[PDB]
Amino acid sequence: MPHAFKPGDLVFAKMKGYPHWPARIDDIADGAVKPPPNKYPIFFFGTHETAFLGPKDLFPYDKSKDKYGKPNKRKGFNEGLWEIQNNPHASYS
């Protein structure tokens, strides 16, 4: 049975106007800006952007990859598919 999300969890993350996007729950670094309550720092593979999102926008990677894990025209997307599959815990700093 599911736990709450934790840093390291791999997901597809949904934002308005984008397709479900390969992404991970980031750790918050010492000195870094904390999310709002009930929100998580989400690192998007490929674009290496961060946004803050609640669980309603977060789709666990393993369950959803068959639906979402497919090339897409958008900039950064296919790079992001490579990262989430081949080195999802790396530093992209």
mmCIF file of N, CA, C and O in Angstrom:
data_model
loop_
_atom_site.group_PDB
_atom_site.id
_atom_site.type_symbol
_atom_site.label_atom_id
_atom_site.label_comp_id
_atom_site.label_asym_id
_atom_site.label_seq_id
_atom_site.Cartn_x
_atom_site.Cartn_y
_atom_site.Cartn_z
ATOM 1 N N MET A 1 0.853 -1.219 0.000
ATOM 2 C CA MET A 1 0.000 0.000 0.000
ATOM 3 C C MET A 1 0.877 1.254 0.000
ATOM 4 O O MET A 1 1.910 1.295 0.662
ATOM 5 N N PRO A 2 0.544 2.272 -0.830
ATOM 6 C CA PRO A 2 1.301 3.529 -0.902
ATOM 7 C C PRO A 2 1.721 4.175 0.423
ATOM 8 O O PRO A 2 1.012 4.088 1.432
ATOM 9 N N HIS A 3 2.917 4.774 0.387
ATOM 10 C CA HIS A 3 3.393 5.739 1.363
ATOM 11 C C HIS A 3 3.186 7.131 0.763
ATOM 12 O O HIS A 3 2.744 7.253 -0.385
ATOM 13 N N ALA A 4 3.496 8.172 1.547
ATOM 14 C CA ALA A 4 3.563 9.536 1.057
ATOM 15 C C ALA A 4 4.772 9.624 0.128
ATOM 16 O O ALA A 4 5.646 8.743 0.159
ATOM 17 N N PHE A 5 4.792 10.638 -0.738
ATOM 18 C CA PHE A 5 5.954 10.818 -1.599
ATOM 19 C C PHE A 5 7.164 11.195 -0.745
ATOM 20 O O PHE A 5 6.997 11.833 0.291
ATOM 21 N N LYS A 6 8.377 10.827 -1.191
ATOM 22 C CA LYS A 6 9.594 11.221 -0.495
ATOM 23 C C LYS A 6 10.652 11.624 -1.523
ATOM 24 O O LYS A 6 10.547 11.247 -2.684
ATOM 25 N N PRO A 7 11.688 12.411 -1.151
ATOM 26 C CA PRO A 7 12.773 12.760 -2.077
ATOM 27 C C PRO A 7 13.322 11.479 -2.710
ATOM 28 O O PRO A 7 13.466 10.479 -2.007
ATOM 29 N N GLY A 8 13.599 11.501 -4.030
ATOM 30 C CA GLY A 8 14.087 10.335 -4.780
ATOM 31 C C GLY A 8 12.982 9.631 -5.593
ATOM 32 O O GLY A 8 13.272 8.919 -6.565
ATOM 33 N N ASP A 9 11.713 9.758 -5.164
ATOM 34 C CA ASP A 9 10.605 9.138 -5.868
ATOM 35 C C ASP A 9 10.557 9.641 -7.308
ATOM 36 O O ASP A 9 10.661 10.846 -7.557
ATOM 37 N N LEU A 10 10.332 8.708 -8.239
ATOM 38 C CA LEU A 10 10.313 9.079 -9.657
ATOM 39 C C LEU A 10 8.858 9.146 -10.096
ATOM 40 O O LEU A 10 8.046 8.333 -9.645
ATOM 41 N N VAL A 11 8.539 10.144 -10.932
ATOM 42 C CA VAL A 11 7.147 10.429 -11.264
ATOM 43 C C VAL A 11 7.053 10.937 -12.699
ATOM 44 O O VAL A 11 8.064 11.264 -13.315
ATOM 45 N N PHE A 12 5.825 10.999 -13.198
ATOM 46 C CA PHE A 12 5.476 11.921 -14.269
ATOM 47 C C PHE A 12 4.661 13.021 -13.612
ATOM 48 O O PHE A 12 3.778 12.732 -12.819
ATOM 49 N N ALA A 13 5.012 14.276 -13.911
ATOM 50 C CA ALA A 13 4.466 15.409 -13.183
ATOM 51 C C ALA A 13 3.653 16.212 -14.194
ATOM 52 O O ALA A 13 4.106 16.411 -15.325
ATOM 53 N N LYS A 14 2.435 16.603 -13.811
ATOM 54 C CA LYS A 14 1.566 17.225 -14.799
ATOM 55 C C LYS A 14 1.436 18.713 -14.508
ATOM 56 O O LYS A 14 0.973 19.089 -13.432
ATOM 57 N N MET A 15 1.794 19.535 -15.496
ATOM 58 C CA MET A 15 1.427 20.941 -15.424
ATOM 59 C C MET A 15 0.576 21.388 -16.601
ATOM 60 O O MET A 15 0.672 20.817 -17.675
ATOM 61 N N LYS A 16 -0.241 22.417 -16.338
ATOM 62 C CA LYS A 16 -1.169 23.036 -17.272
ATOM 63 C C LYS A 16 -0.440 23.345 -18.569
ATOM 64 O O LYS A 16 0.558 24.052 -18.575
ATOM 65 N N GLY A 17 -0.915 22.740 -19.658
ATOM 66 C CA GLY A 17 -0.381 23.087 -20.958
ATOM 67 C C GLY A 17 0.860 22.279 -21.313
ATOM 68 O O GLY A 17 1.415 22.474 -22.387
ATOM 69 N N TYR A 18 1.305 21.376 -20.429
ATOM 70 C CA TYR A 18 2.380 20.482 -20.832
ATOM 71 C C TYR A 18 1.899 19.044 -20.764
ATOM 72 O O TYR A 18 1.024 18.732 -19.963
ATOM 73 N N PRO A 19 2.504 18.111 -21.535
ATOM 74 C CA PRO A 19 2.242 16.681 -21.322
ATOM 75 C C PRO A 19 2.862 16.228 -19.988
ATOM 76 O O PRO A 19 3.744 16.899 -19.448
ATOM 77 N N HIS A 20 2.367 15.110 -19.455
ATOM 78 C CA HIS A 20 2.922 14.503 -18.262
ATOM 79 C C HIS A 20 4.424 14.311 -18.455
ATOM 80 O O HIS A 20 4.870 13.692 -19.427
ATOM 81 N N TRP A 21 5.207 14.802 -17.487
ATOM 82 C CA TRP A 21 6.606 15.047 -17.774
ATOM 83 C C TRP A 21 7.481 14.227 -16.829
ATOM 84 O O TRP A 21 7.225 14.250 -15.639
ATOM 85 N N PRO A 22 8.544 13.528 -17.310
ATOM 86 C CA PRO A 22 9.437 12.781 -16.427
ATOM 87 C C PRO A 22 10.127 13.738 -15.460
ATOM 88 O O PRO A 22 10.564 14.835 -15.841
ATOM 89 N N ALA A 23 10.177 13.306 -14.197
ATOM 90 C CA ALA A 23 10.477 14.186 -13.074
ATOM 91 C C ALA A 23 10.770 13.364 -11.806
ATOM 92 O O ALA A 23 10.513 12.169 -11.771
ATOM 93 N N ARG A 24 11.405 13.984 -10.800
ATOM 94 C CA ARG A 24 11.649 13.349 -9.504
ATOM 95 C C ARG A 24 11.293 14.354 -8.392
ATOM 96 O O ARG A 24 11.266 15.566 -8.630
ATOM 97 N N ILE A 25 10.948 13.841 -7.209
ATOM 98 C CA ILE A 25 10.870 14.629 -5.987
ATOM 99 C C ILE A 25 12.317 14.918 -5.568
ATOM 100 O O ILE A 25 13.080 13.988 -5.277
ATOM 101 N N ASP A 26 12.694 16.200 -5.600
ATOM 102 C CA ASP A 26 14.014 16.640 -5.167
ATOM 103 C C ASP A 26 14.143 16.662 -3.646
ATOM 104 O O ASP A 26 13.163 16.790 -2.912
ATOM 105 N N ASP A 27 15.383 16.493 -3.173
ATOM 106 C CA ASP A 27 15.708 16.889 -1.813
ATOM 107 C C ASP A 27 15.750 18.405 -1.752
ATOM 108 O O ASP A 27 16.117 19.056 -2.717
ATOM 109 N N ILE A 28 15.396 18.960 -0.603
ATOM 110 C CA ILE A 28 15.694 20.358 -0.367
ATOM 111 C C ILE A 28 17.095 20.456 0.239
ATOM 112 O O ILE A 28 17.344 19.926 1.327
ATOM 113 N N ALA A 29 17.988 21.158 -0.472
ATOM 114 C CA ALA A 29 19.344 21.427 -0.007
ATOM 115 C C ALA A 29 19.370 22.467 1.123
ATOM 116 O O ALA A 29 18.529 23.372 1.218
ATOM 117 N N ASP A 30 20.381 22.312 1.984
ATOM 118 C CA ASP A 30 20.743 23.277 3.013
ATOM 119 C C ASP A 30 20.812 24.658 2.384
ATOM 120 O O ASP A 30 21.472 24.813 1.367
ATOM 121 N N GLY A 31 20.045 25.620 2.924
ATOM 122 C CA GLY A 31 20.062 26.969 2.378
ATOM 123 C C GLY A 31 19.061 27.220 1.245
ATOM 124 O O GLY A 31 18.892 28.358 0.839
ATOM 125 N N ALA A 32 18.396 26.178 0.727
ATOM 126 C CA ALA A 32 17.514 26.314 -0.433
ATOM 127 C C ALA A 32 16.135 26.754 0.028
ATOM 128 O O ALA A 32 15.756 26.487 1.170
ATOM 129 N N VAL A 33 15.378 27.354 -0.901
ATOM 130 C CA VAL A 33 14.001 27.760 -0.683
ATOM 131 C C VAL A 33 13.146 26.511 -0.513
ATOM 132 O O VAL A 33 13.239 25.608 -1.337
ATOM 133 N N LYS A 34 12.359 26.475 0.578
ATOM 134 C CA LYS A 34 11.440 25.395 0.912
ATOM 135 C C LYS A 34 10.170 25.580 0.090
ATOM 136 O O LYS A 34 9.782 26.704 -0.205
ATOM 137 N N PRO A 35 9.494 24.488 -0.320
ATOM 138 C CA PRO A 35 8.194 24.614 -0.973
ATOM 139 C C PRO A 35 7.149 25.230 -0.052
ATOM 140 O O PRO A 35 7.323 25.260 1.166
ATOM 141 N N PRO A 36 5.996 25.684 -0.589
ATOM 142 C CA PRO A 36 4.831 25.925 0.257
ATOM 143 C C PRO A 36 4.385 24.628 0.925
ATOM 144 O O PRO A 36 4.663 23.549 0.412
ATOM 145 N N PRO A 37 3.626 24.703 2.046
ATOM 146 C CA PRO A 37 3.006 23.527 2.665
ATOM 147 C C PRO A 37 2.241 22.658 1.666
ATOM 148 O O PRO A 37 1.573 23.163 0.758
ATOM 149 N N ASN A 38 2.353 21.340 1.843
ATOM 150 C CA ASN A 38 1.608 20.388 1.033
ATOM 151 C C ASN A 38 2.096 20.327 -0.418
ATOM 152 O O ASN A 38 1.464 19.643 -1.208
ATOM 153 N N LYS A 39 3.197 21.030 -0.749
ATOM 154 C CA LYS A 39 3.825 21.029 -2.072
ATOM 155 C C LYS A 39 5.230 20.410 -1.990
ATOM 156 O O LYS A 39 5.859 20.423 -0.926
ATOM 157 N N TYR A 40 5.714 19.874 -3.127
ATOM 158 C CA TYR A 40 6.993 19.192 -3.224
ATOM 159 C C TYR A 40 7.825 19.889 -4.286
ATOM 160 O O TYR A 40 7.298 20.308 -5.301
ATOM 161 N N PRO A 41 9.161 19.966 -4.103
ATOM 162 C CA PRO A 41 10.054 20.438 -5.157
ATOM 163 C C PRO A 41 10.183 19.358 -6.232
ATOM 164 O O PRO A 41 10.610 18.227 -5.980
ATOM 165 N N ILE A 42 9.784 19.712 -7.448
ATOM 166 C CA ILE A 42 9.778 18.756 -8.535
ATOM 167 C C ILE A 42 10.814 19.206 -9.548
ATOM 168 O O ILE A 42 10.720 20.314 -10.085
ATOM 169 N N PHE A 43 11.798 18.328 -9.771
ATOM 170 C CA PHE A 43 12.811 18.481 -10.802
ATOM 171 C C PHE A 43 12.370 17.704 -12.048
ATOM 172 O O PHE A 43 12.226 16.482 -12.013
ATOM 173 N N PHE A 44 12.161 18.449 -13.146
ATOM 174 C CA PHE A 44 11.797 17.948 -14.459
ATOM 175 C C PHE A 44 13.067 17.497 -15.169
ATOM 176 O O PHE A 44 14.003 18.308 -15.334
ATOM 177 N N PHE A 45 13.083 16.210 -15.583
ATOM 178 C CA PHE A 45 14.159 15.705 -16.423
ATOM 179 C C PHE A 45 14.163 16.455 -17.756
ATOM 180 O O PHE A 45 13.121 16.945 -18.223
ATOM 181 N N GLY A 46 15.359 16.573 -18.345
ATOM 182 C CA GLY A 46 15.447 17.146 -19.675
ATOM 183 C C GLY A 46 15.611 18.668 -19.651
ATOM 184 O O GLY A 46 16.629 19.148 -20.136
ATOM 185 N N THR A 47 14.618 19.404 -19.102
ATOM 186 C CA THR A 47 14.659 20.864 -18.998
ATOM 187 C C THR A 47 15.415 21.286 -17.737
ATOM 188 O O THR A 47 15.804 22.453 -17.574
ATOM 189 N N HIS A 48 15.530 20.349 -16.788
ATOM 190 C CA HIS A 48 16.203 20.607 -15.531
ATOM 191 C C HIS A 48 15.534 21.783 -14.822
ATOM 192 O O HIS A 48 16.177 22.465 -14.019
ATOM 193 N N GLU A 49 14.234 22.011 -15.075
ATOM 194 C CA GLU A 49 13.549 23.055 -14.326
ATOM 195 C C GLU A 49 13.003 22.468 -13.026
ATOM 196 O O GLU A 49 12.938 21.248 -12.893
ATOM 197 N N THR A 50 12.699 23.348 -12.058
ATOM 198 C CA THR A 50 11.998 23.009 -10.823
ATOM 199 C C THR A 50 10.667 23.748 -10.735
ATOM 200 O O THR A 50 10.605 24.945 -10.966
ATOM 201 N N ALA A 51 9.618 23.038 -10.307
ATOM 202 C CA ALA A 51 8.393 23.700 -9.885
ATOM 203 C C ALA A 51 7.902 23.044 -8.609
ATOM 204 O O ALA A 51 8.395 21.982 -8.211
ATOM 205 N N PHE A 52 6.973 23.723 -7.933
ATOM 206 C CA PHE A 52 6.401 23.168 -6.720
ATOM 207 C C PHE A 52 5.014 22.637 -7.078
ATOM 208 O O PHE A 52 4.265 23.358 -7.730
ATOM 209 N N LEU A 53 4.709 21.387 -6.690
ATOM 210 C CA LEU A 53 3.459 20.738 -7.072
ATOM 211 C C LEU A 53 2.931 19.917 -5.905
ATOM 212 O O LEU A 53 3.718 19.356 -5.138
ATOM 213 N N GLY A 54 1.593 19.824 -5.819
ATOM 214 C CA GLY A 54 0.927 18.902 -4.899
ATOM 215 C C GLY A 54 0.750 17.496 -5.482
ATOM 216 O O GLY A 54 0.807 17.283 -6.689
ATOM 217 N N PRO A 55 0.513 16.465 -4.652
ATOM 218 C CA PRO A 55 0.206 15.108 -5.152
ATOM 219 C C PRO A 55 -0.797 14.860 -6.289
ATOM 220 O O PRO A 55 -0.694 13.867 -7.018
ATOM 221 N N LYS A 56 -1.778 15.758 -6.461
ATOM 222 C CA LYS A 56 -2.730 15.623 -7.568
ATOM 223 C C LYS A 56 -2.050 15.711 -8.935
ATOM 224 O O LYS A 56 -2.593 15.198 -9.915
ATOM 225 N N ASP A 57 -0.861 16.330 -9.009
ATOM 226 C CA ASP A 57 -0.148 16.464 -10.270
ATOM 227 C C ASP A 57 0.981 15.451 -10.452
ATOM 228 O O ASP A 57 1.757 15.542 -11.426
ATOM 229 N N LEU A 58 1.042 14.473 -9.539
ATOM 230 C CA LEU A 58 2.197 13.585 -9.467
ATOM 231 C C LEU A 58 1.785 12.135 -9.709
ATOM 232 O O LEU A 58 1.005 11.585 -8.932
ATOM 233 N N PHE A 59 2.373 11.521 -10.749
ATOM 234 C CA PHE A 59 2.030 10.174 -11.186
ATOM 235 C C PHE A 59 3.232 9.245 -11.073
ATOM 236 O O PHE A 59 4.164 9.330 -11.873
ATOM 237 N N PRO A 60 3.255 8.317 -10.085
ATOM 238 C CA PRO A 60 4.386 7.395 -9.910
ATOM 239 C C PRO A 60 4.856 6.717 -11.198
ATOM 240 O O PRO A 60 4.051 6.172 -11.966
ATOM 241 N N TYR A 61 6.170 6.787 -11.413
ATOM 242 C CA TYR A 61 6.853 6.433 -12.654
ATOM 243 C C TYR A 61 6.481 5.020 -13.126
ATOM 244 O O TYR A 61 5.986 4.844 -14.250
ATOM 245 N N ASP A 62 6.691 4.037 -12.252
ATOM 246 C CA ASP A 62 6.499 2.633 -12.602
ATOM 247 C C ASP A 62 5.085 2.334 -13.120
ATOM 248 O O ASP A 62 4.939 1.719 -14.179
ATOM 249 N N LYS A 63 4.055 2.802 -12.390
ATOM 250 C CA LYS A 63 2.656 2.594 -12.766
ATOM 251 C C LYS A 63 2.277 3.295 -14.073
ATOM 252 O O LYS A 63 1.418 2.778 -14.781
ATOM 253 N N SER A 64 2.908 4.440 -14.397
ATOM 254 C CA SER A 64 2.417 5.359 -15.425
ATOM 255 C C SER A 64 3.284 5.374 -16.683
ATOM 256 O O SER A 64 2.942 6.067 -17.658
ATOM 257 N N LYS A 65 4.446 4.705 -16.627
ATOM 258 C CA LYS A 65 5.433 4.794 -17.707
ATOM 259 C C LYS A 65 4.907 4.245 -19.031
ATOM 260 O O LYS A 65 5.248 4.779 -20.089
ATOM 261 N N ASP A 66 4.074 3.197 -18.970
ATOM 262 C CA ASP A 66 3.506 2.615 -20.180
ATOM 263 C C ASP A 66 2.609 3.638 -20.885
ATOM 264 O O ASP A 66 2.558 3.675 -22.107
ATOM 265 N N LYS A 67 1.927 4.491 -20.113
ATOM 266 C CA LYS A 67 1.044 5.499 -20.671
ATOM 267 C C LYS A 67 1.855 6.710 -21.143
ATOM 268 O O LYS A 67 1.622 7.231 -22.228
ATOM 269 N N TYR A 68 2.824 7.149 -20.328
ATOM 270 C CA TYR A 68 3.416 8.462 -20.516
ATOM 271 C C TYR A 68 4.831 8.387 -21.081
ATOM 272 O O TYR A 68 5.319 9.409 -21.562
ATOM 273 N N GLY A 69 5.481 7.204 -21.009
ATOM 274 C CA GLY A 69 6.904 7.101 -21.301
ATOM 275 C C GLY A 69 7.167 6.926 -22.801
ATOM 276 O O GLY A 69 7.674 5.909 -23.225
ATOM 277 N N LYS A 70 6.806 7.916 -23.616
ATOM 278 C CA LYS A 70 6.816 7.752 -25.066
ATOM 279 C C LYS A 70 7.301 9.055 -25.668
ATOM 280 O O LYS A 70 6.981 10.107 -25.143
ATOM 281 N N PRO A 71 8.137 9.033 -26.725
ATOM 282 C CA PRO A 71 8.728 10.273 -27.228
ATOM 283 C C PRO A 71 7.668 11.348 -27.436
ATOM 284 O O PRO A 71 6.482 11.058 -27.609
ATOM 285 N N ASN A 72 8.118 12.592 -27.354
ATOM 286 C CA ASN A 72 7.246 13.739 -27.447
ATOM 287 C C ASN A 72 8.059 14.826 -28.128
ATOM 288 O O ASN A 72 9.275 14.862 -27.956
ATOM 289 N N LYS A 73 7.351 15.712 -28.843
ATOM 290 C CA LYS A 73 7.933 16.732 -29.697
ATOM 291 C C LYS A 73 8.600 17.815 -28.844
ATOM 292 O O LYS A 73 9.578 18.425 -29.288
ATOM 293 N N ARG A 74 8.103 18.016 -27.609
ATOM 294 C CA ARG A 74 8.503 19.163 -26.795
ATOM 295 C C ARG A 74 10.009 19.148 -26.488
ATOM 296 O O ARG A 74 10.625 18.083 -26.324
ATOM 297 N N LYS A 75 10.579 20.360 -26.393
ATOM 298 C CA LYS A 75 11.989 20.566 -26.099
ATOM 299 C C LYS A 75 12.321 19.959 -24.734
ATOM 300 O O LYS A 75 11.627 20.210 -23.743
ATOM 301 N N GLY A 76 13.397 19.169 -24.698
ATOM 302 C CA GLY A 76 13.884 18.585 -23.462
ATOM 303 C C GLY A 76 13.218 17.254 -23.119
ATOM 304 O O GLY A 76 13.763 16.500 -22.318
ATOM 305 N N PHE A 77 12.059 16.955 -23.719
ATOM 306 C CA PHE A 77 11.275 15.803 -23.284
ATOM 307 C C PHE A 77 12.044 14.480 -23.428
ATOM 308 O O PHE A 77 12.040 13.617 -22.526
ATOM 309 N N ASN A 78 12.675 14.282 -24.588
ATOM 310 C CA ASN A 78 13.241 12.960 -24.850
ATOM 311 C C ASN A 78 14.539 12.814 -24.059
ATOM 312 O O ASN A 78 14.938 11.712 -23.629
ATOM 313 N N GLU A 79 15.211 13.956 -23.860
ATOM 314 C CA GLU A 79 16.360 13.909 -22.969
ATOM 315 C C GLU A 79 15.901 13.439 -21.581
ATOM 316 O O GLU A 79 16.572 12.634 -20.929
ATOM 317 N N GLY A 80 14.736 13.943 -21.155
ATOM 318 C CA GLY A 80 14.199 13.693 -19.833
ATOM 319 C C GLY A 80 13.808 12.232 -19.681
ATOM 320 O O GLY A 80 14.043 11.661 -18.625
ATOM 321 N N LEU A 81 13.289 11.629 -20.765
ATOM 322 C CA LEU A 81 13.032 10.189 -20.814
ATOM 323 C C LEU A 81 14.341 9.408 -20.671
ATOM 324 O O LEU A 81 14.377 8.373 -20.021
ATOM 325 N N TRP A 82 15.427 9.881 -21.286
ATOM 326 C CA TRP A 82 16.688 9.177 -21.069
ATOM 327 C C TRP A 82 17.151 9.257 -19.596
ATOM 328 O O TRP A 82 17.574 8.260 -19.005
ATOM 329 N N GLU A 83 17.034 10.433 -18.973
ATOM 330 C CA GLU A 83 17.528 10.628 -17.615
ATOM 331 C C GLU A 83 16.739 9.782 -16.607
ATOM 332 O O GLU A 83 17.319 9.143 -15.733
ATOM 333 N N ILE A 84 15.405 9.779 -16.717
ATOM 334 C CA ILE A 84 14.581 9.136 -15.711
ATOM 335 C C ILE A 84 14.819 7.628 -15.817
ATOM 336 O O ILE A 84 14.634 6.937 -14.818
ATOM 337 N N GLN A 85 15.203 7.134 -17.014
ATOM 338 C CA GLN A 85 15.394 5.697 -17.194
ATOM 339 C C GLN A 85 16.832 5.250 -16.883
ATOM 340 O O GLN A 85 17.005 4.179 -16.310
ATOM 341 N N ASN A 86 17.841 6.089 -17.182
ATOM 342 C CA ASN A 86 19.253 5.702 -17.149
ATOM 343 C C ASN A 86 20.054 6.302 -15.986
ATOM 344 O O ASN A 86 21.001 5.673 -15.523
ATOM 345 N N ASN A 87 19.750 7.528 -15.529
ATOM 346 C CA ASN A 87 20.433 7.973 -14.322
ATOM 347 C C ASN A 87 19.557 8.964 -13.560
ATOM 348 O O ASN A 87 19.893 10.153 -13.470
ATOM 349 N N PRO A 88 18.418 8.501 -12.989
ATOM 350 C CA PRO A 88 17.453 9.433 -12.409
ATOM 351 C C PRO A 88 17.846 10.114 -11.102
ATOM 352 O O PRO A 88 17.190 11.094 -10.758
ATOM 353 N N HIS A 89 18.901 9.614 -10.418
ATOM 354 C CA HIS A 89 19.389 10.143 -9.143
ATOM 355 C C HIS A 89 20.668 10.980 -9.258
ATOM 356 O O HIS A 89 21.240 11.378 -8.235
ATOM 357 N N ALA A 90 21.087 11.297 -10.488
ATOM 358 C CA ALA A 90 22.332 12.053 -10.672
ATOM 359 C C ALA A 90 22.169 13.508 -10.264
ATOM 360 O O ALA A 90 21.063 14.025 -10.092
ATOM 361 N N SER A 91 23.313 14.172 -10.191
ATOM 362 C CA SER A 91 23.348 15.616 -10.137
ATOM 363 C C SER A 91 23.253 16.180 -11.551
ATOM 364 O O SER A 91 24.059 15.856 -12.423
ATOM 365 N N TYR A 92 22.252 17.027 -11.781
ATOM 366 C CA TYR A 92 22.109 17.728 -13.050
ATOM 367 C C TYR A 92 22.434 19.212 -12.848
ATOM 368 O O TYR A 92 22.092 20.040 -13.692
ATOM 369 N N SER A 93 23.118 19.513 -11.733
ATOM 370 C CA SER A 93 23.521 20.856 -11.319
ATOM 371 C C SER A 93 24.288 21.617 -12.422
ATOM 372 O O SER A 93 24.748 20.976 -13.398
#
